Design a protein around this motif. Sequence first.
Motif, PDB file in Angstrom:
ATOM      1  N   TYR A  70       1.716   4.256  -1.640  1.00 28.15           N
ATOM      2  CA  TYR A  70       1.156   4.051  -2.962  1.00 28.15           C
ATOM      3  C   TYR A  70       1.936   3.031  -3.819  1.00 28.15           C
ATOM      4  O   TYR A  70       1.324   2.183  -4.509  1.00 28.15           O
ATOM      5  N   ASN A 114       4.586   0.797  -2.901  1.00 27.50           N
ATOM      6  CA  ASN A 114       4.586  -0.540  -2.279  1.00 27.50           C
ATOM      7  C   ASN A 114       4.331  -0.566  -0.799  1.00 27.50           C
ATOM      8  O   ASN A 114       5.238  -0.506   0.028  1.00 27.50           O
ATOM      9  N   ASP A 145     -10.538  -4.619 -10.314  1.00 33.71           N
ATOM     10  CA  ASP A 145      -9.266  -4.955  -9.724  1.00 33.71           C
ATOM     11  C   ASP A 145      -9.143  -6.431  -9.351  1.00 33.71           C
ATOM     12  O   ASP A 145      -8.057  -7.013  -9.484  1.00 33.71           O
ATOM     13  N   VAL A 190      -4.720  -9.193  -1.875  1.00 29.89           N
ATOM     14  CA  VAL A 190      -4.684  -7.783  -2.196  1.00 29.89           C
ATOM     15  C   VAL A 190      -6.077  -7.179  -2.105  1.00 29.89           C
ATOM     16  O   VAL A 190      -6.864  -7.200  -3.074  1.00 29.89           O
ATOM     17  N   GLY A 212      -8.349  -0.895   0.434  1.00 32.97           N
ATOM     18  CA  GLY A 212      -7.255  -1.093   1.379  1.00 32.97           C
ATOM     19  C   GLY A 212      -7.331  -0.325   2.693  1.00 32.97           C
ATOM     20  O   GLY A 212      -6.719  -0.749   3.691  1.00 32.97           O
ATOM     21  N   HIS A 244       1.476  -1.914 -10.969  1.00 35.35           N
ATOM     22  CA  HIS A 244       0.577  -1.908  -9.793  1.00 35.35           C
ATOM     23  C   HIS A 244       0.662  -0.579  -9.029  1.00 35.35           C
ATOM     24  O   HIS A 244       1.698   0.084  -9.061  1.00 35.35           O
ATOM     25  N   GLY A 287      -1.367   1.855  -5.509  1.00 32.84           N
ATOM     26  CA  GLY A 287      -2.404   2.222  -4.558  1.00 32.84           C
ATOM     27  C   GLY A 287      -2.292   1.594  -3.188  1.00 32.84           C
ATOM     28  O   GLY A 287      -1.711   0.536  -3.045  1.00 32.84           O
ATOM     29  N   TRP A 288      -2.821   2.281  -2.183  1.00 30.33           N
ATOM     30  CA  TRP A 288      -3.027   1.705  -0.845  1.00 30.33           C
ATOM     31  C   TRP A 288      -4.439   1.906  -0.308  1.00 30.33           C
ATOM     32  O   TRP A 288      -4.992   0.995   0.329  1.00 30.33           O
ATOM     33  N   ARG A 319      -6.268  -0.732  -4.151  1.00 28.96           N
ATOM     34  CA  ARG A 319      -5.088  -1.318  -4.784  1.00 28.96           C
ATOM     35  C   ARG A 319      -5.465  -2.372  -5.829  1.00 28.96           C
ATOM     36  O   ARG A 319      -6.366  -3.189  -5.599  1.00 28.96           O
TER      37      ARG A 319
END
Length: 393
Positions: free
Chosen positions: A17, A19, A235, A272, A276, A373, A375-376, A379
């Motif tokens: 989440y 990085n 996003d 990005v 994801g 920032h 999320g995965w 994101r």
Amino acid sequence: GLLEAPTADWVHLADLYQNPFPIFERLRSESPVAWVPEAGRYLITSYSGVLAADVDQTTFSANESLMLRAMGHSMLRKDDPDHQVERRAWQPSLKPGTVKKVWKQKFAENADRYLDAYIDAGSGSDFMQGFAAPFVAENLRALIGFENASEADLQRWSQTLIDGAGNYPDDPDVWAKAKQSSDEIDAALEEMIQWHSGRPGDSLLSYLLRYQMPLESIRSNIKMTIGGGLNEPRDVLGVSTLALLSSSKQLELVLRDPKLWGAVFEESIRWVAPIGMVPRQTVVDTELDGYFIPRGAKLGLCILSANRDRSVWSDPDRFDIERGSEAHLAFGKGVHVCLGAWAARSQVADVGLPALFSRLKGLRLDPNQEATHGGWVFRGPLSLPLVWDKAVR
Ligand SMILES: C=CC1=C(C)c2cc3[nH]c(cc4nc(cc5[nH]c(cc1n2)c(C)c5C=C)C(C)=C4CCC(=O)O)c(CCC(=O)O)c3C
Ligand SMILES: [Fe+3]
């Protein structure tokens, strides 16, 4: 022969989440198919593996889960043949030609309204909530045909349904909120179905009601669209804006040739990916990247990682519109390939970004309010404070 997929128990959800990119570099390099205990899935992290799995629905089914309780059963979580019939009923309002002729104008109206409100909010304000989110919400409201909902309704529905779909902790309040969104949408659709039947128009609901989709599938597909069509373009607006305000070379390229706004959008979603990870379940014993995968295995196709694969793009960790983004997987590639891609591109590249950069003079990042920032699975920037010297329209 075939290799056993290793267990990567050093991979923790909290680190993904916060990085994910350094985690995915290691995985691509050491183990592009890996069992991740906390995820309850084998994560697929190479471009080759994600692509292979995504284009072969007979082996890697879209039909596994929490999505069903949150939203019901939508076309996204079906395979063909049932998927294809629903997808085709969903297409008309989202074709590139209809976006150009009908929707671009409505987006441009909405960009004016929401940029004026951001201008009123003032220099220093968060762009994510201050412009991006209500703009794309009101756009989605129009695309669908929701006359009896506000952009704010749409923002709340989107987040609560997404959250319900990832409620592994089984928070009861998380389920209660997604349920209440589901009920509200059901009520709102009842009234909109009567309104849109018989009535010419180019909204999704208008075309749909002219194969008659059963009500339970209309509800499920609408919830999925709300969940898929708001946070994602919001996003991309954040990522693109940040990337251009972080590199004066990249921004100059665009100002010198505004035809490159499209390339900005495509490079942002490569750099990005807004979505994801997408889930699949195997129907037979199989293999990806020379690794065995057992029948019934649950997979997470890590698009976020695939779009950073150093065998596909030179220096993939850099935002670079000249290198470009050819064959990125942000919209996917199989039979589920994003139905919204043209509407997304028009909202963001053709309307939202040029409007922003032409109306706010001296637009820059705030040295005293750094962007954040997360999320995965999905994101983007959580907050993006901007400053500017003077504002047009
Ligand atoms: C930058 C913005 C966006 C991204 C990156 C995006 C990504 C996706 N959208 C998908 C499916 C989808 N996207 C969809 C409607 C939208 N999608 C939108 C914006 C985005 N959607 C907007 C805006 C939409 C509607 C207005 C729908 C309806 C599907 C399901 C298509 C299907 O199952 O055939 C999928 C699934 C692909 C696969 O191979 O599994 C991805 C990855
Ligand atoms: Fe999509």
